[PDB]
Write an enzyme that holds these catalytic residues in place. Structure first.
Site, PDB file in Angstrom:
ATOM      1  N   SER A  22      19.447  29.652 -15.813  1.00  0.00           N
ATOM      2  CA  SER A  22      18.889  29.121 -14.535  1.00  0.00           C
ATOM      3  C   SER A  22      18.398  30.419 -13.397  1.00  0.00           C
ATOM      4  CB  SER A  22      19.768  28.435 -13.758  1.00  0.00           C
ATOM      5  OG  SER A  22      19.591  26.947 -14.328  1.00  0.00           O
ATOM      6  N   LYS A  59      15.002  31.318 -12.000  1.00  0.00           N
ATOM      7  CA  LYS A  59      14.376  30.443 -10.919  1.00  0.00           C
ATOM      8  C   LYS A  59      13.963  31.174  -9.717  1.00  0.00           C
ATOM      9  CE  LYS A  59      16.477  26.145 -12.754  1.00  0.00           C
ATOM     10  NZ  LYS A  59      17.728  25.283 -13.154  1.00  0.00           N
ATOM     11  N   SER A 117      20.019  24.709  -8.398  1.00  0.00           N
ATOM     12  CA  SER A 117      19.757  24.742  -9.670  1.00  0.00           C
ATOM     13  C   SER A 117      19.200  23.629 -10.410  1.00  0.00           C
ATOM     14  CB  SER A 117      21.038  25.221 -10.457  1.00  0.00           C
ATOM     15  OG  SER A 117      20.605  26.192 -11.599  1.00  0.00           O
ATOM     16  N   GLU A 162      12.857  23.983 -18.829  1.00  0.00           N
ATOM     17  CA  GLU A 162      14.077  22.957 -18.798  1.00  0.00           C
ATOM     18  C   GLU A 162      14.071  21.731 -19.650  1.00  0.00           C
ATOM     19  OE1 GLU A 162      16.742  24.311 -17.908  1.00  0.00           O
ATOM     20  OE2 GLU A 162      16.378  25.846 -16.216  1.00  0.00           O
ATOM     21  N   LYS A 213      21.915  33.988  -7.543  1.00  0.00           N
ATOM     22  CA  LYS A 213      21.307  32.767  -8.495  1.00  0.00           C
ATOM     23  C   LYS A 213      22.023  32.802  -9.690  1.00  0.00           C
ATOM     24  CE  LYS A 213      19.579  29.042  -9.606  1.00  0.00           C
ATOM     25  NZ  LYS A 213      20.910  28.721 -10.388  1.00  0.00           N
ATOM     26  N   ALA A 271      23.857  29.017 -16.344  1.00  0.00           N
ATOM     27  CA  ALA A 271      24.823  28.762 -17.291  1.00  0.00           C
ATOM     28  C   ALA A 271      24.081  28.040 -18.452  1.00  0.00           C
ATOM     29  CB  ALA A 271      25.762  27.542 -16.988  1.00  0.00           C
TER      30      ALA A 271
END
Ligand SMILES: [Ca+2]
Ligand SMILES: [Ca+2]
Ligand SMILES: [Ca+2]
Ligand SMILES: [Ca+2]
Ligand SMILES: [Ca+2]
Ligand SMILES: [Ca+2]
Ligand SMILES: [Ca+2]
Ligand SMILES: [Ca+2]
Ligand SMILES: [Cl-]
Length: 260
Positions: free
Chosen positions: A41, A44, A99, A135, A203, A206
């Site tokens: 993530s 982003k 997230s 994603e 930010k 995982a």
């Protein structure tokens, strides 16, 4: 690189990548800073940067619509607005502060997909990041797989370009900066390793193979010049767990080195 950082690897049974540069002290600390990790993530805010770099005001205020079928796992904000859509700025906020995974996908799509975003980042000097999937497939993090990877040095440097340098107009730079400062997911990571009164934007990430990352900017109290920091980590087993204390401790070590 740094020796107390090496100890952390054994303590936590991880591979650890760290890059931090103090823009005021003109000093950096690094450890495995050119080794690849899945960014998860942490991409982003780079996607948000690219959006704030390349889109017009109108495009930022445009309503983006999507369907129930478009929602991927862990989309707390975007799952509330299927019927009415969201603006790119609202999508950016959701991606960075919560997230939100569908928000991540909407940013990727707005930029023309992972490969096109990659080309945009190449053009501001990121020769390293390799983007390929959406994603949540981009979280796979298989060792030796180049897809959806970067390095601690490249992640730190690219974040620096958007947050501290002149890639973005000052007004949009402040928007991105405040989203990072107001992140809700990072209290146990970089934030936990910084002294009271210091401001942090970050930010987290995982993913597979116990991947656990945090990238950010630290402003020491008193208007001191900022420190840019990226910490990435991963483990040997597919379903391995991570420990947030790794990131807190790496941060403490970084600040000990930079500030002393
Ligand atoms: Ca400097
Ligand atoms: Ca180094
Ligand atoms: Ca769902
Ligand atoms: Ca470069
Ligand atoms: Ca690619
Ligand atoms: Ca590709
Ligand atoms: Ca403008
Ligand atoms: Ca403007
Ligand atoms: Cl693509």
């Amino acid at each position: 690189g740094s020796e107390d950082l090496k100890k952390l690897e054994e303590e936590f049974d991880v591979r650890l990548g760290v890059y931090a540069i103090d823009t005021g002290a003109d000093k950096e600390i690094s450890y495995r800073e050119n080794e690849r990790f899945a960014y998860t993530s942490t991409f982003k805010p780079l996607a948000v940067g690219a959006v704030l770099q390349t889109k017009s005001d109108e495009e930022l205020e445009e309503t983006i619509t999507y369907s129930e079928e478009d929602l991927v796992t862990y989309s707390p904000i975007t799952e509330q607005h299927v019927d009415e859509g969201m603006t790119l700025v609202e999508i950016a906020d959701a991606a960075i502060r919560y997230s939100d995974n569908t928000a991540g996908n909407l940013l990727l799509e707005a930029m023309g997909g992972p490969d096109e975003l990659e080309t945009i980042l190449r053009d501001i000097g990121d020769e390293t990041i390799e983007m390929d999937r959406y994603e949540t497939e981009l979280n796979e993090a298989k060792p030796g797989d180049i897809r959806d990877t970067s390095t601690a040095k490249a992640m730190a440097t690219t974040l620096q370009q958007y947050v501290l340098e002149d890639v973005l107009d000052a007004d949009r730079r402040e928007v991105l900066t405040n989203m990072l400062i107001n992140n809700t997911t990072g209290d146990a990571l970089i934030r936990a390793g910084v002294p009271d009164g210091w401001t942090v934007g970050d930010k987290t990430g995982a993913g597979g193979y116990g991947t656990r990352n945090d990238i950010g900017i630290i402003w020491p109290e008193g208007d001191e010049e900022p420190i840019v920091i990226a910490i990435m980590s991963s483990r040997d087993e597919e379903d391995a767990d991570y420990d947030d204390k790794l990131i807190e401790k790496a941060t403490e070590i970084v600040l000990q080195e930079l500030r002393n």
